[PDB]
């Protein structure tokens, strides 16, 4: 593609990314740096006040279970936001419908983890559209396997945030993830990889212009897709352990279906 | 950041060392595999009897073969270790980090280079004098049948990138100098080296495959496929250690797999 076309693709994706995701990384960074203070959850009692004063709809049973399930609720919300964003990626909706479903099915976890880093620092994570802040330490100290469920996310985020990407960078990176041609069961790989090459071209030029001093940032960001795949695999295995161990997890059958 | 002429110098250096360190190059392997040559033709092993005739021309069957791969993996580690010492800056790192970069890097490199010896139907063995079919491996008993097929599945996809040896010399280097390995003491000097290696690989791929659009990015995404195969392999080994009480690993391989 010609350079002026890549910038156009980058601008298109940035605009769409702003419309699809309410809490941007720029905004999140303002809140975390202390630059209306969020409600802070750092222990059990502040949690009990947090739901009462600000209605957390992911957390309206044991506390560590409540919190785990609340993360499920929000992940379901995020999936719909990512699905709307993907439709704005040039070429996506023209793909075979089964392939569109397949790309989203296997991609959303990688994107959720990526975008969750925009809401985290080394000390905690923004929640409920940025009105709250849950500390890392409180999450880490949740009992039995739930404590060891949240920390891998922080560990990735700390490393990922060291790249210092902004929203215009992330908009293209997110697009690149969705258009992965190696997803199982794809019917027509060719147009998927063709779009990804254009997106990779766009991301490469974006990083060079926006971070001229950051040598081989393109390569370094692509290496992070190894960290994502591995963390997604780990996550899936942790779920299986909870399903086979915890007698206290069942929800309403309808809710179980929603969270399948 | 480096100058273009400096990066070409680094690529030539690494290609030269790779030729010195690895006796069975991809160019040679493909000449043997593509045939048409009466002097380089391998003996083909596809079943029990030809395996038995193979020993003339070049315990239980699956163990013998598994032990054969263990032996060759040890040799490969020795070759990779020698190559790594030639990577500018590697020998100047903290010794513990040198050991750590090799601990986690050798397998990812072994599977990369094993692809050079593979096609969809089998793999070259014994310095290219032999060829073991995929199906014969897949038909070995117990957990051994399922041991090589993941590698074949990777190689088919990886070989579709059509890299040659001069490309692989830099890619192998980029893998070793990974700053995200667990337990590294000084990540920064490792990452500075990798930046120059990545710069070198980027320019090398552009010059050597000018029509192969975004080959650089596509090659880096393959480093994800490598990580998954190493995990899968290590889990299979653990199963055998708990099932075959009489079976033994090389000290070198034994230490590599500790964590
Ligand atoms: O605003 C957002 O975009 C967003 C994105 C991700 C998370 C989040 N997800 N998550 C997972 O376990 C997870 C992941 Cl990574 C990916 C896929 C599926 C899941 C899940 F298993 F939950 F189904 C977390 C684990 C630890 C910490 C967090 Cl913050 C998460 C999120 O939590 C909001 C929240 C947290 C606690 C209580 C109430 C709400 C918000």
Curated annotation (Swiss-Prot), chain A:
Molecular-function GO term, any one: DNA-binding transcription factor binding
Lineage, uppermost ranks: Eukaryota, Metazoa, Chordata, Craniata, Vertebrata
Protein's recorded name: Peroxisome proliferator-activated receptor gamma
Function: Nuclear receptor that binds peroxisome proliferators such as hypolipidemic drugs and fatty acids. Once activated by a ligand, the nuclear receptor binds to DNA specific PPAR response elements (PPRE) and modulates the transcription of its target genes, such as acyl-CoA oxidase. It therefore controls the peroxisomal beta-oxidation pathway of fatty acids. Key regulator of adipocyte differentiation and glucose homeostasis. ARF6 acts as a key regulator of the tissue-specific adipocyte P2 (aP2) enhancer.
Residues of the full protein shown: 235 to 502 of 505
Binding residues annotated for rosiglitazone, in chain numbering: 72-75, 109, 235, 259
Parts of the chain that traverse the membrane: none
Any one biological process term the GO annotation gives: response to nutrient
Regulation: PDPK1 activates its transcriptional activity independently of its kinase activity.
Effect of residue 19 to R: More than 50% loss of ubiquitination
Principal location: nucleus
Quaternary assembly: Interacts with FOXO1 (acetylated form). Heterodimer with other nuclear receptors, such as RXRA. The heterodimer with the retinoic acid receptor RXRA is called adipocyte-specific transcription factor ARF6. Interacts with NCOA6 coactivator, leading to a strong increase in transcription of target genes. Interacts with coactivator PPARBP, leading to a mild increase in transcription of target genes. Interacts with NOCA7 in a ligand-inducible manner. Interacts with NCOA1 and NCOA2 LXXLL motifs. Interacts with ASXL1, ASXL2, DNTTIP2, FAM120B, MAP2K1/MEK1, NR0B2, PDPK1, PRDM16, PRMT2 and TGFB1I1.
PTM statement from Swiss-Prot or TrEMBL: Phosphorylated in basal conditions and dephosphorylated when treated with the ligand. May be dephosphorylated by PPP5C.
Record motif 9aaTAD, residues: 253-260
Gene expressing this chain: PPARG
Domain NR LBD: 5-260
Disorder this protein is connected to according to its UniProt record: Defects in PPARG can lead to type 2 insulin-resistant diabetes and hyptertension. PPARG mutations may be associated with colon cancer. Obesity: A condition characterized by an increase of body weight beyond the limitation of skeletal and physical requirements, as the result of excessive accumulation of body fat.
Cell location: Nucleus; Cytoplasm
Family label: Belongs to the nuclear hormone receptor family. NR1 subfamily.
A GO CC term attached to the entry: receptor complex
Domain notes: The 9aaTAD motif is a transactivation domain present in a large number of yeast and animal transcription factors.
Keywords of this entry: Activator, Biological rhythms, Cytoplasm, Diabetes mellitus, Disease variant, DNA-binding, Glycoprotein, Isopeptide bond, Metal-binding, Nucleus, Obesity, Phosphoprotein, Receptor, Transcription, Transcription regulation, Ubl conjugation, Zinc, Zinc-finger
Induction summary: (Microbial infection) Expression increases when incubated with M.tuberculosis or its lipoprotein LpqH; induction is TLR2-dependent (at protein level).
Tissue expression per record: Highest expression in adipose tissue. Lower in skeletal muscle, spleen, heart and liver. Also detectable in placenta, lung and ovary.
Covalent link location (Glycyl lysine isopeptide (Lys-Gly) (interchain with G-Cter in ubiquitin)): 19
């Amino acid at each position: 593609m010609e350079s002026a076309d890549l910038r156009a693709l980058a601008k298109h994706l940035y605009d769409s990314y702003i419309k699809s995701f309410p809490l941007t990384k720029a905004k999140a960074r303002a809140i975390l740096t202390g630059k209306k203070s969020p409600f802070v959850i750092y222990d059990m009692n502040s949690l009990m006040m947090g739901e009462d004063k600000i209605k957390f709809k992911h957390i309206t049973k044991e506390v560590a279970i409540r919190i785990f399930q609340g993360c499920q609720f929000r992940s379901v919300e995020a999936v719909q936001e990512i699905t709307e964003y993907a439709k704005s990626i040039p070429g996506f909706v023209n793909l075979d419908l089964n392939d569109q479903v397949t790309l989203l099915k296997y991609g959303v976890h990688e994107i959720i983890y990526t975008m969750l880093a925009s809401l985290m620092n080394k000390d905690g994570v923004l929640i409920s559209e940025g009105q709250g802040f849950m500390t890392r330490e409180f999450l880490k100290s949740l009992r039995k396997p739930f404590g060891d469920f949240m920390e891998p996310k922080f560990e990735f985020a700390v490393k990922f945030n060291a790249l210092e990407l902004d929203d215009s960078d992330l908009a293209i990176f997110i697009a690149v993830i969705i258009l992965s041609g190696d997803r199982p069961g794809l019917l027509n790989v060719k147009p998927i990889e063709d779009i990804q090459d254009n997106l990779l071209q766009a991301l490469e030029l974006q990083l060079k212009l926006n971070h001229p001093e950051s040598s081989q940032l393109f390569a370094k960001l692509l290496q992070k897709m190894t960290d994502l795949r591995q963390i997604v695999t780990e996550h899936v295995q942790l779920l299986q352990v909870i399903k086979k161990t915890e007698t206290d997890m069942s929800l309403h059958p309808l809710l179980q279906e929603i969270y399948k």
